Amino acid sequence: MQEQVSNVRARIYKPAKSTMQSGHSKLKAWKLEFEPSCTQYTEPLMNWTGSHDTKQQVCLSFTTRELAIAYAVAHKIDYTVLQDNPRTIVPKSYADNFTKPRDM
């Protein structure tokens, strides 16, 4: 009882909460991954010496969310934001007080 749609979607993921300025020499915090459309292209040209290059999966890497969402918004694409950790709810507490009369 579902409906078929012919459109792509954007997958945005946020980094993990950690102390910044903890020694970094790169620019990558947010991740982006859009679904396939048609006539996909081949991965970009990459090569390294110190460490063997990995095979990309058409995945994109952004630094600021403004850059990520900007991509989807460019074509009004449905972008989803994923958190690194779950969202816990505050501890449900409750106070209690009583009072009695003052007999002579």
Automatic annotation (TrEMBL):
<dbReference type="Pfam" id="PF04800">
    <property type="entry name" value="NDUS4"/>
</dbReference>
<keyword id="KW-0679">Respiratory chain</keyword>
<dbReference type="GO" id="GO:0016020">
    <property type="term" value="C:membrane"/>
</dbReference>
<protein>
    <submittedName>
        <fullName>Oxidoreductase</fullName>
    </submittedName>
</protein>
<keyword id="KW-0249">Electron transport</keyword>
<keyword id="KW-0813">Transport</keyword>
<keyword id="KW-0809">Transit peptide</keyword>
<dbReference type="GO" id="GO:0022900">
    <property type="term" value="P:electron transport chain"/>
</dbReference>
<dbReference type="InterPro" id="IPR038532">
    <property type="entry name" value="NDUFS4-like_sf"/>
</dbReference>
<dbReference type="InterPro" id="IPR006885">
    <property type="entry name" value="NADH_UbQ_FeS_4_mit-like"/>
</dbReference>
<keyword id="KW-0472">Membrane</keyword>
